[PDB]
Amino acid sequence: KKVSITVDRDPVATSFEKWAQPGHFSRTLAKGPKTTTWIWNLHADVHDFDSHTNSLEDISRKIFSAHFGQLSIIFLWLSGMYFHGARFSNYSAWLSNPTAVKPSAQVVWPIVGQEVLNGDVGGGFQGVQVTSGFFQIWRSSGITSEVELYWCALAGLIMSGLMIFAGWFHYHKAAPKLEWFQNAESMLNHHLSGLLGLGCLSWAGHQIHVSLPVNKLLDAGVAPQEIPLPHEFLVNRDLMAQLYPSFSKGLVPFFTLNWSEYSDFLTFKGGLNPVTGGLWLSDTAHHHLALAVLFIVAGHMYRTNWGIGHSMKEILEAHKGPFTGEGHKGLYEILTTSWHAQLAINLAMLGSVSIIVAHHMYAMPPYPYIATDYPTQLSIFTHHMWIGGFCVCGGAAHAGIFMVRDYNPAQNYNNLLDRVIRHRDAIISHLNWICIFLGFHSFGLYIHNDTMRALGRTQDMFSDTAIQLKPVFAQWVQSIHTLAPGNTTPNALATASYAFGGDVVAVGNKVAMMPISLGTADFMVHHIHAFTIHVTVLILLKGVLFSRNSRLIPDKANLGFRFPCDGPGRGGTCQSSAWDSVFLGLFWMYNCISVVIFHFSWKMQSDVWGTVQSDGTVTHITGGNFAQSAITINGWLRDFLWAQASQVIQSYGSALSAYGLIFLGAHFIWAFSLMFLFSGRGYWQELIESIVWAHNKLNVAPAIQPRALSITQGRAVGLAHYLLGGIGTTWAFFLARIISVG
Amino acid sequence: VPQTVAWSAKTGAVMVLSNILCIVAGRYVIQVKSGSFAGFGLPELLASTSLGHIVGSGAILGLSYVGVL
Amino acid sequence: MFLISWRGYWQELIETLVWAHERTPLANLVRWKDKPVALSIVQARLVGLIHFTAGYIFTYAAFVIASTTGKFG
Amino acid sequence: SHSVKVYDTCIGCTQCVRACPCDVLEMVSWDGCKAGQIASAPRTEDCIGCKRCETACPTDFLSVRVYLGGETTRSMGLAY
Amino acid sequence: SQFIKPYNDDPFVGNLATPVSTSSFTKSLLSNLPAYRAGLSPLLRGVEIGLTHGYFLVGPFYKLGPLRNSDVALLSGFFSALGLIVILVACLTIYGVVSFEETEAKDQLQTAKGWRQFTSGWLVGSVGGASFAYILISNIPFLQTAGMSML
Amino acid sequence: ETLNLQIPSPTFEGSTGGWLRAAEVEEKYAITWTSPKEQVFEMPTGGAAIMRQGENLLYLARKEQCLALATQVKNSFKITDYKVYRIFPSGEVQYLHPKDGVFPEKVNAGRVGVGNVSHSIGKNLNPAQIKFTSKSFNG
Amino acid sequence: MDSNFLKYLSTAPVLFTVWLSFTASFIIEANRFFPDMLYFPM
Amino acid sequence: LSVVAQSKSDFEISDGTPYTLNVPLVGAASFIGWVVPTLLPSQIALYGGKGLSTAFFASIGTNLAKFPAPPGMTDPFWLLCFIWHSGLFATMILGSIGYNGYAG
Ligand code: CLA
Ligand code: CLA
Ligand code: CLA
Ligand code: CLA
Ligand code: CLA
Ligand code: CLA
Ligand SMILES: CC1=C(C/C=C(\C)CCC[C@H](C)CCC[C@H](C)CCCC(C)C)C(=O)c2ccccc2C1=O
Ligand code: SF4
Ligand code: SF4
C-alpha cells in the first residue's frame, strides 16, 4: 500500500495579517515599494509559486487550493447563468417557440438611455439577446420550467461554497504531502475511471431517464407544462415504456448481454433530428454510455496498490530505438517533479480539444434548435477557437518555463529532450523553410489573383472558372463519409454530419446543416491555415528550443525565462528570451484564429446558412459569393469585411447599438496598444522626469517614485490591449452581423 | 441492428471459458503479484475475472453478431 | 513586423539559416561574402517607420483620388 | 571594436569585472579610492557591447562606460 | 545500435552523422552528382548541371506562362527559359568576380578560373538542354499535353 | 603553458550547435579544465556532455562560449582550473584567460590600467568643441 | 473589528475600487433622479 | 533506390555503423503477414464480398483495363489502396522493428 493518504494538519494559520502586508510572498517585494515598479512586480509574480518557494511540497499545496478557488468561481459563474435564465429570461416563451423567440437572459436598467439595449427579443420580453447556447442546453437537459432553473442555480451556489471551503480546508487545515501529489498512476486511474467514466455514465443515466422522455414529448409537440415531471419517468416504468417499449424488459437485457433489446433508446442513427436540427439524443445517450465504459476500462491500466497494472516509468523507459538514444528515460521524473511540464502538456491538449470542439459542434449540432440559431453557432465556434489558440500558446509558454528552470541536463543525458536540443538548428531551419514555402504558395496565390483580376486577366487566375487548385483529398474524404452509412459503417442509418454531403436539413425554413463543398477558395484558405499554424509553431518552438542558450547568448538560462534583452551588443539582443517568443507567437496565433473564424463566418453565410422555400432551393445569407470572391484579398476586404460591417456601423439607435459602441471602442484599444508596442521605455522615463519636475515645483511629488513600465511590461501591456482590441472588434462585428441577418 | 440472444447456457459457456482463459493468462502475464497456488490472491483473481467479463462480453456479442451465438 | 518584433528573435533564426546553408549539399558550394545578420536596432525602427509611412501614403492617395473620381462630387 | 572607459569615480567594487562575459575588464592597482583598485579595460577588442558591466556598476553615474563603435566578428558575437 | 553519431568523429563540430546525412545511399548519390563526381573538369560539371536545369526550365514556362493558350506557347516558353538562363549566367559571372581571387588553379570549382569554366559549361548546357526539350515537345503530342492525348 | 593538443575531450554525442566554417578559417577557441569526477555538464552550444575525470578539452567558436562554460564549471562543479585559448588556422595558439595567471577580479602587480579617465564622466568635452578637431572628448 | 482586516481594506486597490464605485454610484443616482442635464439650469 | 539483403554487404546506415537492412525478408514477411489476414471477406460494398487485399487486387486490374483513364473519386480503388498500404506500411515498420532489433 505505497499509495497512501498523507496530510499535514493545521499547516498554515488562517490570519488576516499577511493580507495587510502586500507582497509578503517574496523576499524582494516584502520590504515595500520605493518605485512604482514594485506595484507592477507585485501582480506580475504573485501566482508564480515556484519563484517564491524552494520546496515542491508547498508549491503543490498552493496549486491544489488555488484549483479549488478556480472551481468556486466557475460554479458561481454557472449558478449565475442559471439564475439569469430563471429570473431575467424569456426561456419559457422560447420553449414554446424555439424557432421564433430569440434567447435573452440579460436585462439592463434604465439609466442614461441605455434601456434601448432591451430590444424586442420576442415572447413579450425585452432584453439583451444571448448567444451562449444555454437555452439549447437546458432544453437538451429537459429543464422545461424556471422553477428547475432556480434549483440548478442553488446547486451551483452550494457547490461554489463547497469548493471555496475545500480550498481553504486543504491549505489551512489538512494539506496533503508531496508524496500524495506524486501519485500519477492513482490520479490517472481516478480521473479516467472516476471523473471521466462515472461522469459520462451518470450523464448517460440523466439522458436516458430524463432527457430522452422529456425531449420526445417536446418534439412530438406536447406543451412544456403538459409534460410529466422528470421523476415520474423514474417511478412509473409503464409511462416510460410507452415512449420507449424496451423499458418493459428492465435491466435483464443489460445483465444477460441481450443489448439489442435497448435499441429504442440506444441507437446509432447519425445525422440530425429533422424536428430540432440537432443530434438524436438516443445517439448521445449511447455515445456517453459507450464512452463511460472505456473510460472506466482505461482507468484500470496503471498500478497503484495491488500488483496488477502498468508502471508508467517502465512503459516510457522501454520505448527506445536506434534513432533516439536512451528514449523516453527520465520523462517520468520530469512529469512528476515539474508542474510547468505538466501544465505545458495539459494546456496544449486542452487548447487542441477546444479547437476540436469548435469544429465538431458546428458540423454535428448537438443541441435541439442550436443549428438554426446562427448567432449561437457563430458565437460558440469563435469562442472555442480563441480558447484553443490561447491555451496552445500557454503550452509553449510553460514548456519554456520548464526548460529555463526545471530542466536539469544531468538527469536528461542522451534522452529525447537532450536529443531535441542537440539538433534544434535542423528543426528550426526546416520549419523556417516550410513557413517561407507555405507563405509564398498560399498567400502568394492570393497576390497572383489580386494582380490578374486587377489586370483584366481572369483566365490567368487560380479559380474554379480558370486554373483550378482543387482540394481532391478533402473532396475524396467527403465522398467516403457520405458512402459510409450502410457500407463501412453498416449499422449507421445516416452520415456523421451532413457537411460531408447528403441532404439539406431545414428547421423553421432555416438551414440546420447541408454539404459544405470545397473548391479553389477552400484549397487556398486551408493552406493559409497551414501557413499560419506552422509559423506559430515556428515562433513558439524556437522559443522553447533556444530558451536556455543560443549561438547568440551562451548563458540565456542564467538570465531567466523572462528578460528583456542582454544589451545592445552583439548587434542587439532585444526580445531574446523565451517569454518574448510567447509574446511574438500570440500575435501569430491571433493572426491564425482570425482567419479561421473569418473563413468559418463567410463560408457558412455564403454556402450553408440561409432560408429554404418552394423547390427546396436555399437562399444563403451572402448568396454564394465565397467561391469567386474569397480568392482575392480585395474580395475579402470588399465582400466580407466591408459588406458585413454594415450592420455594426448602422446599429446606432437600435438594440445592437452596444455592438456599434464596442466596435469603435475596440478599434480604439487596438490602436492605443501600438503606443506600447512601437515605443521604448527610455522615452517614457525621460518624459516622466519633466512631469516629476512640475510636481517637485508644487511640492506634490509622490514617495513611490514613478517609473516608466519595464521593457517586458511595455510588451505585455501592448500585447494585452492589442488582443483586447483586435478580438473585441471581431466580437462586435460578428455578433451584430449575425443577430441582424441570422 | 446486430442480433443478440437471450441468456442461455451457451452464453454461460462462452463466459465461463473466457473467465478461465484469463485466469490462466493472469497467472502467466501479470508481472507483479503450484501453478495457481503460488501468490494467487483476490486482486489477481478479481482482475482476471474482470478481463474475463470484458473478453467474454465481447466474444458473446461478436458470436451473436456473426451467427455462431 | 519591424516595429513589434525586435532583433534577438531574428538573429537567432538567421543563425539556424546560416547552419542549414553550410550543411546542405550542392548549396554550400555558394558562399556569402558578407555574413548574414539581423538588421540593427535603429535600422529596424527606420525600416518599420518607412513601411508604416509608405503604407499610410499609398492607402490615402488611392482613397482620396479614387473616392473623389468615383463620386465626382 | 567598442570603446570602454573607466572614470575615476570607480570605488573598486570589482562587480563590472565579475559581470563581464568576455573577460574585457580587470582590476589594476590604484590609490584614488578606499579599495585601492580601479577597473581597467585592456581587452576591448573582445568587448561585445552587452553593457553588463554598466548594469553591475553602483556609482551614481557609471564609472564604466561602453561606447558602441565599429562592428567586428568578435563584437557582433558571431559564431559564424 | 545507434544511427546518429558526431560528424567525422568530431563531437564539437556543428553537424551530426545522421542516415540522411551520411548513409551509404546518400554518400553514393552525392559522390556521383556532377558537382562532386571525380574525374570531371569544372566545365564538364557545368555542362551536365546545365543540361539538366535547362531541360526542366522549359516546361513550367510553356505550360503555365502568359502565352500558354496560344500557338506560340512553346516559343514563348523557350525564350522565357532562355531569358532566365541568361539572367542566371549573369549571377554566376558576378559571383566569380567577387568571390574568387585570381590564381592558376583551374580544376576546382571554387577557383576564379574554375568558376569561369563552370559558368561557361552551364550556359552552353542550359541552352542545349532547353533546346532539346523544345525539340521534344514540338514534335511529340504526348509532351504538349500532360499525357492527355490518350484520353 | 602551451595547449597540449592531445588532452582528451568530454564525452559528447554531437550537436548542430557547434562551430561552423568560420572556426576553421578565422579562429577557434579552446578551454581546458581539470575535473575530479566523471560528471555531466551542460554544453553552451546545446545539450549535455560528460567531462572525464582528469583533464578535459573543448573547442568553441566564440570566446563568450568558453567563458560561459567556465562560469558554469566554477559555480556548480567548483573547478577553478580553467584556461582559455585562442587558436588561429595558422596553428598559432594564443592564451587568453586568466591572462596573467590571476583572475581579473583579483588585483595583480604589473597590470597597467587601460581606458582609465582622470575625471568623472560629467567632465567630458561637448561635441561642438571637438568638431573638425581630432581632440578626444575625454578631456 | 480586526485591525489587520481594516489595514487590508485601507490598501490602495480596495480604497480605489470602493471610492470610484461610490463615486460612480452617486453619478448614476444623480442621473436617475435628475436626467438629461446638458446645461446648468439658468 | 536499392535493396540490401540479409547477407553482409558493406552498406552503413550512417557514418561508421554498418547495419543490415533486411529488405528481402522484411518486405516478404510484411507483405505476406498483412495480405493473408486481409484475405478475410466481407459482404460490404467497398469489398464486394472479397477481402481487402482481393478487392484491392481486383481494383488494380479493373482500372488497368481502362489503362489511360484514372480511377474516379467515388471509385473504390482509392479507399482500398489507402487502407491496404496503411496496414502494409505499418506491418513493414513493425516488421523492420521486430526483425532488425530483436533479431529473433
Ligand atoms: C458570476 C457571474 C455573474 C454575472 C456576470 C452577473 C451579472 C449581472 N447580474 Mg447577476 N447574479 C449572479 C451572478 C452573476 N451576475 C448570481 C450567482 C446571482 C444569485 C445571487 C445573481 C443574481 C442577480 C440579481 C438578483 C440581479 C443580478 C443582476 C445582474 C446585472 C447587474 C449587476 C449589478 O450591477 O449589481 C451591482 C450591485 C452592487 C452591490 C454593486 C457592487 C459593486 C462593488 C463595489 C464591487 C466590488 C467587489 C469587491 C471590491 C471585491 C473585493 C472584496 C473586498 C473585501 C476587497 C449583471 C448583468 C441584476 C439584473 O440583471 O437586473 C436586471 C439583478 O437584479 N444578478
Ligand atoms: C473518483 C475520484 C476522483 C475524482 C472525481 C476527482 C475529481 C477531480 N480532481 Mg482529482 N484526485 C483523485 C481522485 C479524484 N479526483 C485522487 C485519488 C488524487 C490523488 C492522487 C487526486 C488528486 C488531484 C489533484 C492534485 C488535483 C485534482 C483535481 C481534480 C478536479 C479536476 C478539475 C475538474 O474537472 O473539476 C470539475 C469537474 C467536476 C465534476 C467538479 C466536481 C467536484 C467534486 C469534487 C467531484 C466528485 C463529487 C462526488 C464524488 C460525486 C457524488 C455523486 C453523487 C451525487 C451520487 C476534479 C474535481 C484538480 C483540482 O481542480 O483540484 C481541486 C487538482 O489539482 N485531483
Ligand atoms: C474560459 C473558458 C471557457 C468558457 C467561458 C466556456 C464557455 C462555454 N462553453 Mg466551453 N470549453 C472550454 C472553455 C470555455 N468554455 C474548453 C477549454 C473546452 C474543452 C474541454 C470547452 C468545451 C466545451 C464543450 C464541449 C461545450 C462547451 C460549452 C460552453 C458554453 C456553456 C457553458 C456550460 O454550461 O458548459 C456546458 C458544457 C456541456 C453541457 C458539455 C461539456 C462536455 C465536455 C466534454 C465535458 C468535459 C469535462 C472534462 C472534465 C474536461 C476534460 C478535458 C480533457 C482535455 C481531459 C459556454 C459558451 C457548451 C456549448 O457550447 O453549448 C452551447 C458545450 O457543449 N465548452
Ligand atoms: C491553466 C492555465 C494557466 C495557468 C495555471 C498559468 C499559470 C501561470 N502562468 Mg501561464 N499562460 C496560460 C495559462 C496558464 N498560466 C496561457 C493560456 C497563456 C497564454 C497567454 C500563458 C502565458 C504565460 C506567460 C507568457 C507567462 C505565464 C506565467 C504564469 C505564472 C504566473 C501567473 C501570474 O502571476 O500572473 C498574474 C496574473 C495577472 C497579472 C493577470 C493579468 C493578465 C491579463 C492582462 C488580464 C486579463 C484580461 C481579461 C481577461 C480581460 C479584461 C477585460 C477588459 C475589457 C477590461 C503561473 C505559473 C508567467 C511566468 O513567469 O510563469 C513562471 C509568464 O511570464 N503564463
Ligand atoms: C502584412 C504584414 C506582414 C508580412 C507580409 C510578414 C511577413 C513575414 N513574416 Mg512577419 N510579422 C508581422 C507582419 C507581417 N509579416 C507582424 C505584425 C508581426 C508582429 C508580431 C510579425 C512577426 C513575425 C515573426 C515573429 C515571424 C514572422 C515571419 C514572417 C515570414 C513568414 C514566412 C513567409 O510567409 O514567407 C513568404 C513571404 C511573404 C508571404 C511576404 C510577402 C511576399 C509575397 C508573396 C509577394 C512577394 C513579391 C516579390 C518578392 C516581389 C519581387 C520583386 C520586387 C522586389 C520588385 C514573412 C517574412 C516568420 C519568419 O520569418 O519565419 C519564416 C517569423 O518567425 N513575422
Ligand atoms: C502489424 C503487424 C505486427 C504487429 C502488431 C507486431 C507486433 C509485435 N512483434 Mg512482430 N513482426 C511483424 C509484424 C508485426 N509485429 C513482421 C511482419 C515481422 C517479420 C519481418 C515481425 C517480426 C518480429 C520479431 C522477430 C519479433 C517481433 C516482436 C513483436 C512484439 C513486440 C515488438 C514490436 O514489434 O513491438 C510492436 C508493439 C506492439 C504492436 C504493441 C504496442 C501497441 C501499439 C498500439 C502499437 C500499434 C501499432 C499499429 C497501429 C498496429 C498495426 C496493426 C495493423 C493495422 C497493421 C509485438 C507483439 C518481438 C516479440 O515480442 O517476440 C514475440 C520479436 O522478437 N516481431
Ligand atoms: C505610454 C507608455 C508608458 C507610460 C505609461 C505608464 C507609466 C503607466 C500609466 C498607467 C497609469 C499610471 C495607471 C493605469 C490606470 C489605467 C487608467 C487603467 C489600467 C487598467 C489596470 C492597470 C487596472 C511606458 O511606461 C512604456 C514603457 C515601455 C514601452 C512603452 C511604454 C508606453 O507606451
Ligand atoms: S534596452 Fe531595449 S533597445 Fe536596448 S537591447 Fe534591451 S530591449 Fe533592445
Ligand atoms: S560591454 Fe559587455 S563585454 Fe564589453 S566590457 Fe562591458 S560587460 Fe564586458
JSON list of C-alpha atoms in Angstrom, two decimals, chain A residues 628-741:
[
{"chain": "A", "resi": 628, "resn": "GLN", "atom": "CA", "xyz": [-15.49, 33.59, -56.76]},
{"chain": "A", "resi": 629, "resn": "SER", "atom": "CA", "xyz": [-14.60, 36.28, -54.24]},
{"chain": "A", "resi": 630, "resn": "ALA", "atom": "CA", "xyz": [-12.62, 34.58, -51.47]},
{"chain": "A", "resi": 631, "resn": "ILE", "atom": "CA", "xyz": [-9.78, 34.04, -53.97]},
{"chain": "A", "resi": 632, "resn": "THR", "atom": "CA", "xyz": [-8.62, 37.67, -53.91]},
{"chain": "A", "resi": 633, "resn": "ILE", "atom": "CA", "xyz": [-7.71, 39.88, -50.95]},
{"chain": "A", "resi": 634, "resn": "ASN", "atom": "CA", "xyz": [-9.96, 42.56, -52.45]},
{"chain": "A", "resi": 635, "resn": "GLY", "atom": "CA", "xyz": [-12.79, 40.07, -52.24]},
{"chain": "A", "resi": 636, "resn": "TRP", "atom": "CA", "xyz": [-12.15, 39.54, -48.53]},
{"chain": "A", "resi": 637, "resn": "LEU", "atom": "CA", "xyz": [-11.86, 43.29, -47.99]},
{"chain": "A", "resi": 638, "resn": "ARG", "atom": "CA", "xyz": [-14.92, 44.19, -50.08]},
{"chain": "A", "resi": 639, "resn": "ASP", "atom": "CA", "xyz": [-17.26, 41.21, -49.97]},
{"chain": "A", "resi": 640, "resn": "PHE", "atom": "CA", "xyz": [-16.50, 40.13, -46.41]},
{"chain": "A", "resi": 641, "resn": "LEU", "atom": "CA", "xyz": [-15.26, 42.97, -44.19]},
{"chain": "A", "resi": 642, "resn": "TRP", "atom": "CA", "xyz": [-16.88, 45.92, -45.94]},
{"chain": "A", "resi": 643, "resn": "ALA", "atom": "CA", "xyz": [-20.17, 44.21, -46.88]},
{"chain": "A", "resi": 644, "resn": "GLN", "atom": "CA", "xyz": [-20.71, 42.62, -43.45]},
{"chain": "A", "resi": 645, "resn": "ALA", "atom": "CA", "xyz": [-19.55, 45.63, -41.35]},
{"chain": "A", "resi": 646, "resn": "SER", "atom": "CA", "xyz": [-22.78, 47.38, -42.48]},
{"chain": "A", "resi": 647, "resn": "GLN", "atom": "CA", "xyz": [-24.84, 46.00, -39.54]},
{"chain": "A", "resi": 648, "resn": "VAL", "atom": "CA", "xyz": [-22.40, 47.11, -36.76]},
{"chain": "A", "resi": 649, "resn": "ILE", "atom": "CA", "xyz": [-21.92, 50.65, -38.26]},
{"chain": "A", "resi": 650, "resn": "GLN", "atom": "CA", "xyz": [-25.68, 51.25, -38.84]},
{"chain": "A", "resi": 651, "resn": "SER", "atom": "CA", "xyz": [-26.55, 49.82, -35.41]},
{"chain": "A", "resi": 652, "resn": "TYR", "atom": "CA", "xyz": [-26.85, 53.17, -33.59]},
{"chain": "A", "resi": 653, "resn": "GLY", "atom": "CA", "xyz": [-30.31, 53.78, -32.16]},
{"chain": "A", "resi": 654, "resn": "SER", "atom": "CA", "xyz": [-31.18, 50.07, -32.07]},
{"chain": "A", "resi": 655, "resn": "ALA", "atom": "CA", "xyz": [-30.71, 47.31, -29.52]},
{"chain": "A", "resi": 656, "resn": "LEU", "atom": "CA", "xyz": [-27.45, 46.50, -31.33]},
{"chain": "A", "resi": 657, "resn": "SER", "atom": "CA", "xyz": [-26.01, 49.96, -30.68]},
{"chain": "A", "resi": 658, "resn": "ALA", "atom": "CA", "xyz": [-23.96, 48.34, -27.89]},
{"chain": "A", "resi": 659, "resn": "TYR", "atom": "CA", "xyz": [-22.12, 46.35, -30.55]},
{"chain": "A", "resi": 660, "resn": "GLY", "atom": "CA", "xyz": [-21.65, 49.55, -32.53]},
{"chain": "A", "resi": 661, "resn": "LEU", "atom": "CA", "xyz": [-20.04, 51.19, -29.50]},
{"chain": "A", "resi": 662, "resn": "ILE", "atom": "CA", "xyz": [-17.84, 48.16, -28.73]},
{"chain": "A", "resi": 663, "resn": "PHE", "atom": "CA", "xyz": [-16.77, 48.10, -32.41]},
{"chain": "A", "resi": 664, "resn": "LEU", "atom": "CA", "xyz": [-15.39, 51.63, -32.06]},
{"chain": "A", "resi": 665, "resn": "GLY", "atom": "CA", "xyz": [-14.14, 51.10, -28.50]},
{"chain": "A", "resi": 666, "resn": "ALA", "atom": "CA", "xyz": [-12.13, 48.04, -29.51]},
{"chain": "A", "resi": 667, "resn": "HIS", "atom": "CA", "xyz": [-10.72, 49.82, -32.59]},
{"chain": "A", "resi": 668, "resn": "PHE", "atom": "CA", "xyz": [-9.55, 52.41, -30.04]},
{"chain": "A", "resi": 669, "resn": "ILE", "atom": "CA", "xyz": [-7.96, 49.91, -27.62]},
{"chain": "A", "resi": 670, "resn": "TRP", "atom": "CA", "xyz": [-6.16, 48.18, -30.51]},
{"chain": "A", "resi": 671, "resn": "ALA", "atom": "CA", "xyz": [-4.66, 51.44, -31.78]},
{"chain": "A", "resi": 672, "resn": "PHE", "atom": "CA", "xyz": [-3.79, 52.55, -28.24]},
{"chain": "A", "resi": 673, "resn": "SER", "atom": "CA", "xyz": [-1.85, 49.29, -27.83]},
{"chain": "A", "resi": 674, "resn": "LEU", "atom": "CA", "xyz": [0.52, 50.39, -30.59]},
{"chain": "A", "resi": 675, "resn": "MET", "atom": "CA", "xyz": [1.68, 53.19, -28.31]},
{"chain": "A", "resi": 676, "resn": "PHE", "atom": "CA", "xyz": [3.12, 50.50, -26.05]},
{"chain": "A", "resi": 677, "resn": "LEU", "atom": "CA", "xyz": [4.34, 48.21, -28.84]},
{"chain": "A", "resi": 678, "resn": "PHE", "atom": "CA", "xyz": [6.17, 50.67, -31.08]},
{"chain": "A", "resi": 679, "resn": "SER", "atom": "CA", "xyz": [7.69, 52.72, -28.25]},
{"chain": "A", "resi": 680, "resn": "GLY", "atom": "CA", "xyz": [10.52, 52.18, -25.81]},
{"chain": "A", "resi": 681, "resn": "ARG", "atom": "CA", "xyz": [10.88, 52.69, -22.07]},
{"chain": "A", "resi": 682, "resn": "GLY", "atom": "CA", "xyz": [13.70, 55.25, -22.33]},
{"chain": "A", "resi": 683, "resn": "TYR", "atom": "CA", "xyz": [11.48, 57.84, -23.98]},
{"chain": "A", "resi": 684, "resn": "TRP", "atom": "CA", "xyz": [8.80, 57.45, -21.32]},
{"chain": "A", "resi": 685, "resn": "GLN", "atom": "CA", "xyz": [11.10, 57.72, -18.33]},
{"chain": "A", "resi": 686, "resn": "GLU", "atom": "CA", "xyz": [12.55, 60.98, -19.64]},
{"chain": "A", "resi": 687, "resn": "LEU", "atom": "CA", "xyz": [9.04, 62.33, -20.26]},
{"chain": "A", "resi": 688, "resn": "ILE", "atom": "CA", "xyz": [8.12, 61.33, -16.68]},
{"chain": "A", "resi": 689, "resn": "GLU", "atom": "CA", "xyz": [11.16, 63.32, -15.42]},
{"chain": "A", "resi": 690, "resn": "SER", "atom": "CA", "xyz": [9.68, 66.61, -16.63]},
{"chain": "A", "resi": 691, "resn": "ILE", "atom": "CA", "xyz": [6.31, 65.62, -15.13]},
{"chain": "A", "resi": 692, "resn": "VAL", "atom": "CA", "xyz": [8.08, 64.78, -11.84]},
{"chain": "A", "resi": 693, "resn": "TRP", "atom": "CA", "xyz": [9.73, 68.22, -12.03]},
{"chain": "A", "resi": 694, "resn": "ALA", "atom": "CA", "xyz": [6.38, 70.04, -12.16]},
{"chain": "A", "resi": 695, "resn": "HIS", "atom": "CA", "xyz": [5.32, 68.07, -9.10]},
{"chain": "A", "resi": 696, "resn": "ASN", "atom": "CA", "xyz": [8.54, 68.93, -7.33]},
{"chain": "A", "resi": 697, "resn": "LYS", "atom": "CA", "xyz": [7.80, 72.56, -8.22]},
{"chain": "A", "resi": 698, "resn": "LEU", "atom": "CA", "xyz": [4.45, 72.33, -6.42]},
{"chain": "A", "resi": 699, "resn": "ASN", "atom": "CA", "xyz": [5.85, 70.07, -3.64]},
{"chain": "A", "resi": 700, "resn": "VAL", "atom": "CA", "xyz": [3.47, 67.26, -4.65]},
{"chain": "A", "resi": 701, "resn": "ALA", "atom": "CA", "xyz": [5.92, 64.60, -5.80]},
{"chain": "A", "resi": 702, "resn": "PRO", "atom": "CA", "xyz": [4.99, 61.08, -4.65]},
{"chain": "A", "resi": 703, "resn": "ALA", "atom": "CA", "xyz": [7.14, 58.99, -2.34]},
{"chain": "A", "resi": 704, "resn": "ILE", "atom": "CA", "xyz": [6.61, 55.96, -4.59]},
{"chain": "A", "resi": 705, "resn": "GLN", "atom": "CA", "xyz": [8.80, 57.32, -7.39]},
{"chain": "A", "resi": 706, "resn": "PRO", "atom": "CA", "xyz": [7.06, 56.99, -10.77]},
{"chain": "A", "resi": 707, "resn": "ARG", "atom": "CA", "xyz": [8.78, 54.87, -13.35]},
{"chain": "A", "resi": 708, "resn": "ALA", "atom": "CA", "xyz": [8.08, 54.02, -16.92]},
{"chain": "A", "resi": 709, "resn": "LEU", "atom": "CA", "xyz": [6.87, 50.42, -17.20]},
{"chain": "A", "resi": 710, "resn": "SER", "atom": "CA", "xyz": [9.55, 47.78, -17.62]},
{"chain": "A", "resi": 711, "resn": "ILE", "atom": "CA", "xyz": [10.66, 46.72, -21.09]},
{"chain": "A", "resi": 712, "resn": "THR", "atom": "CA", "xyz": [8.78, 43.44, -20.61]},
{"chain": "A", "resi": 713, "resn": "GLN", "atom": "CA", "xyz": [5.67, 45.13, -19.18]},
{"chain": "A", "resi": 714, "resn": "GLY", "atom": "CA", "xyz": [5.52, 47.52, -22.14]},
{"chain": "A", "resi": 715, "resn": "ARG", "atom": "CA", "xyz": [5.49, 44.41, -24.32]},
{"chain": "A", "resi": 716, "resn": "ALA", "atom": "CA", "xyz": [2.89, 42.74, -22.11]},
{"chain": "A", "resi": 717, "resn": "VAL", "atom": "CA", "xyz": [0.66, 45.84, -21.97]},
{"chain": "A", "resi": 718, "resn": "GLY", "atom": "CA", "xyz": [0.94, 46.36, -25.72]},
{"chain": "A", "resi": 719, "resn": "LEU", "atom": "CA", "xyz": [0.06, 42.74, -26.46]},
{"chain": "A", "resi": 720, "resn": "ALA", "atom": "CA", "xyz": [-2.86, 42.68, -24.00]},
{"chain": "A", "resi": 721, "resn": "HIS", "atom": "CA", "xyz": [-4.53, 45.77, -25.46]},
{"chain": "A", "resi": 722, "resn": "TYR", "atom": "CA", "xyz": [-3.80, 44.51, -28.99]},
{"chain": "A", "resi": 723, "resn": "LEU", "atom": "CA", "xyz": [-5.60, 41.28, -28.19]},
{"chain": "A", "resi": 724, "resn": "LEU", "atom": "CA", "xyz": [-8.41, 43.03, -26.34]},
{"chain": "A", "resi": 725, "resn": "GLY", "atom": "CA", "xyz": [-8.82, 45.46, -29.20]},
{"chain": "A", "resi": 726, "resn": "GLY", "atom": "CA", "xyz": [-8.38, 43.04, -32.09]},
{"chain": "A", "resi": 727, "resn": "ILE", "atom": "CA", "xyz": [-10.64, 40.33, -30.67]},
{"chain": "A", "resi": 728, "resn": "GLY", "atom": "CA", "xyz": [-13.17, 42.83, -29.31]},
{"chain": "A", "resi": 729, "resn": "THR", "atom": "CA", "xyz": [-13.57, 44.38, -32.76]},
{"chain": "A", "resi": 730, "resn": "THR", "atom": "CA", "xyz": [-14.32, 40.98, -34.31]},
{"chain": "A", "resi": 731, "resn": "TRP", "atom": "CA", "xyz": [-16.66, 40.06, -31.42]},
{"chain": "A", "resi": 732, "resn": "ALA", "atom": "CA", "xyz": [-18.86, 43.11, -32.05]},
{"chain": "A", "resi": 733, "resn": "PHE", "atom": "CA", "xyz": [-18.63, 42.69, -35.83]},
{"chain": "A", "resi": 734, "resn": "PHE", "atom": "CA", "xyz": [-19.55, 39.01, -35.61]},
{"chain": "A", "resi": 735, "resn": "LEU", "atom": "CA", "xyz": [-22.38, 39.47, -33.12]},
{"chain": "A", "resi": 736, "resn": "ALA", "atom": "CA", "xyz": [-24.14, 42.50, -34.61]},
{"chain": "A", "resi": 737, "resn": "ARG", "atom": "CA", "xyz": [-23.84, 40.98, -38.10]},
{"chain": "A", "resi": 738, "resn": "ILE", "atom": "CA", "xyz": [-25.25, 37.55, -37.30]},
{"chain": "A", "resi": 739, "resn": "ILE", "atom": "CA", "xyz": [-28.00, 38.75, -34.93]},
{"chain": "A", "resi": 740, "resn": "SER", "atom": "CA", "xyz": [-29.32, 41.05, -37.67]},
{"chain": "A", "resi": 741, "resn": "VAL", "atom": "CA", "xyz": [-29.18, 38.61, -40.58]}
]
